């Protein structure tokens, strides 16, 4: 009987009989099924095939950020330098991303998280203050690595496996590395489902993160915000309380998931939705991603179109209409007028 | 109490005490209100103002087609030449226009009228055959005037008031005259509501036609077919039996109407919807229209946009998506995906 959906599978055993890395109670509970993302060696031809076909895979032995595996708050505070770091703060576990430039278009959007620039030692101290007073405030540091980092971090950065990732960039025809985002979160933090328009090698350093991915063909089930809204590219669906009246096809969504730990690298293909959560009671998490611009669009389109190309078309229709109407608020009414009693 | 809608008004009296030109029983009955289109002399500055503002007006004294006022079936059969004339045939009074080039896109569209090419004497004879046998078949001749017409028709054509209409073309910045369509219909024939993308001076020659116009801002109430459908630019609504479940905003439509007779010229502005019916029991009708390409689009758009510019935008979105998806049938599903739970 057809009535597969293993999810992250049986938790892995840490070497030296150090016990399970995590347990099922540290995962949040959601309404949809999932199947596992494959975990493979970087020397496995299957892994090359998945990356080539823009499908996710966890690579267990790239050594991509090997020198960063010794990173923790004390080491970073000593060596990360005196630059500013963007720290998001929220009274909820969900850190929904928003584009500050688009907030003028939507005056009624009130962010639930707020950004504060601070030095790294201030970040560590605010964490301490929270932890000792039993506070419910949550922090998520998210900052691109820049030229202000200290000498030891430079040394560690130079020690990444550029041989391997530069070869991937070349083999896939991708554009330049645009940035490395340092992500330091508290246990239980969640980045809600969204897609990015760049290719991502997501390199886990400390702690464990559950990553739930959805292919671009589930656009219909995930209901992104309007393109001019500050939450462009993020799902409108509250995974903790899905509104099935507004979002009926969320009842059909099916994810791919994995739990990445220190040394793992997750390939998140461009336009793939991803929901990322730091495991409950797992301590702080540290990740560095590697964002690459996608390979150029082919000069002559080949049919059938891929799912992500249809997403690109819809985004461009929304952008063009916003510019032509002179106001993004008129996009919706025009689109509805175009469809009602004509295409629906 | 605000609870104006005169319609065509009290029928006009024919000169020489020849009685009313028409009576209310010769008009079909419809569900919506209407107000009158103004009837003015071409020397009235109000008429110039209406044409300039792309609003309809009936001009009563242009002499635009003065030499054609003696036209009837016998005169035309003698002098119109031996060319082919497109004659549409239908078992209904409604002659819904369709684009034969688009029929490959929609295999399930079965036209209710059929086109037959014939000589003018064959057209007259088929009319006779119908009239004598009490048949229910209906014919509508619709043919652009071309270089095959006989010498007397050339003389009559040369006698049109080109001084007047060439001045209008110049004053409005319109493009070239593209064609003169000769329209010869049977009493009771109806051309269902549609808009054209050219400017039209509609010159009535024989019989009376009731013209019901709707401004471009009633797009929302009139539900045009998809752009790739053969009935592009025609309303989907059956005015004789409006489906208010599919077309709810047809309950809000408001028209402008008039009855034109011999010597009248109706300005039908580009993008204005028009429904045209030859009066019941009024005999055959003869019209010649004058179609002009619109004035060029301004280089820099000025806001707010006019209603017809929003129509132009929607048409271009539908066209572009058809080309990009490689198949017009995919337009609807993509548009719905773009709107559902996002803009509606």
């Amino acid at each position: 009987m057809a009535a597969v959906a293993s999810g992250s599978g049986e938790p892995r055993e840490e070497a030296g009989a150090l016990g399970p890395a995590w347990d099922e109670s540290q995962l949040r509970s959601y309404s949809f099924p999932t199947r596992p993302i494959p975990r493979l060696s970087q020397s496995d031809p299957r892994a090359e095939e998945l990356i080539e076909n823009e499908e996710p895979v966890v690579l267990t032995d790239t050594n991509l950020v090997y020198p960063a595996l010794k990173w923790d708050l004390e080491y970073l505070q000593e060596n990360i330098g005196n630059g500013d770091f963007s720290v998001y703060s929220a009274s909820t576990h969900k850190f929904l991303y928003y584009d500050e430039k688009k907030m003028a278009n939507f005056q009624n959007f009130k962010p639930r998280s707020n950004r504060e620039e601070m030095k790294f030692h201030e970040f560590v101290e605010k964490l301490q203050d929270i932890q000792q007073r039993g506070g419910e405030e949550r922090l998520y540091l998210q900052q691109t690595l820049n030229d202000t980092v200290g000498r030891k971090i430079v040394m560690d950065f130079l020690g990444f496996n550029w041989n391997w990732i530069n070869k991937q960039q070349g083999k896939r025809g991708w554009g330049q590395l645009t940035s490395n985002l340092l992500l330091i979160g508290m246990e239980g933090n969640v980045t809600p489902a969204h897609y990015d328009e760049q290719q991502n090698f997501f390199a886990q350093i400390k702690g464990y993160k559950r990553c739930i991915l959805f292919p671009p063909d589930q656009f219909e089930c995930l209901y992104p915000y309007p393109v001019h809204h500050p939450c462009d590219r993020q799902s409108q669906v509250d995974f903790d309380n899905p509104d099935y009246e507004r979002f009926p096809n969320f009842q059909n969504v099916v994810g791919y998931e994995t739990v990445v730990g220190p040394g793992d690298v997750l390939y998140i293909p461009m336009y793939w939705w991803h929901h990322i959560e730091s495991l409950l009671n797992g301590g702080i998490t540290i990740t560095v991603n590697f964002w690459y611009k996608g390979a150029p669009t082919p000069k002559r389109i080949e049919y059938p179109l891929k799912a992500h190309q249809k997403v690109a078309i819809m985004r461009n229709i929304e952008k063009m209409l916003g510019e032509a109407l002179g106001n993004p608020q008129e996009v919706g009414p025009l689109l509805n007028t175009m469809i009602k009693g004509r295409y629906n | 109490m605000a609870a104006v809608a005169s319609g065509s008004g009290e029928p006009r009296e024919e000169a020489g005490a020849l009685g009313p030109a028409w009576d209310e029983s010769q008009l079909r009955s419809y569900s919506f209100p209407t107000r009158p289109i103004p009837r003015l002399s071409q020397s009235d500055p109000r008429a110039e103002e209406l044409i300039e503002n792309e609003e309809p007006v009936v001009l009563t004294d242009t002499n635009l087609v003065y030499p054609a006022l003696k036209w009837d079936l016998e005169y035309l059969q003698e002098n119109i030449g031996n060319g082919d004339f497109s004659v549409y045939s239908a078992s209904t009074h409604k002659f819904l226009y369709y684009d034969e080039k688009k029929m490959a896109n929609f295999q399930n569209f079965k036209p209710r009228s059929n086109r037959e090419e014939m000589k003018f004497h064959e057209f007259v004879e088929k009319l006779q055959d119908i009239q004598q046998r009490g048949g229910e078949e209906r014919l509508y001749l619709q043919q652009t005037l071309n270089d095959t017409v006989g010498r007397k028709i050339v003389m009559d054509f040369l006698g049109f008031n080109w001084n007047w209409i060439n001045k209008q073309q110049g004053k409005r910045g319109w493009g070239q005259l593209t064609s003169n369509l000769l329209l010869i219909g049977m009493e009771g024939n109806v051309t269902p509501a549609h808009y054209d993308e050219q400017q039209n001076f509609f010159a009535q020659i024989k019989g009376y036609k009731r013209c019901i116009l709707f401004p471009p801002d009633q797009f929302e109430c009139l539900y045009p077919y998809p752009v790739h459908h053969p009935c592009d630019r025609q309303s989907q609504v059956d005015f004789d039996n409006p489906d208010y479940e599919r077309f709810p905003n047809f309950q809000n439509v408001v028209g402008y109407e008039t009855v034109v007779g011999p010597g009248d010229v109706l300005y039908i502005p580009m993008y204005w919807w028009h429904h045209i019916e030859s009066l019941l029991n009024g005999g055959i009708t003869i019209t010649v229209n004058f179609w002009y390409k619109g004035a060029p689009t301004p280089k820099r758009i000025e806001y707010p946009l006019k209603a017809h510019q929003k129509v132009a935008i929607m048409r271009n979105i539908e066209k572009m998506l058809g080309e990009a998806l490689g198949n017009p049938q995919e337009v609807g599903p993509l548009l719905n995906t773009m709107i559902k739970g996002r803009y509606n």
């Binding site: 980045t191 462009d232 590219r233 992500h308 461009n316 | 998506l321």
Partner: peptide, 16 residues
């Protein structure tokens, strides 16, 4: 053009 509509941007969850 058909090519333009398929073109992608480079937007990511990162402040400029």
């Amino acid at each position: 053009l058909a090519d333009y509509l398929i073109s992608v941007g480079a937007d990511i969850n990162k402040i400029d």
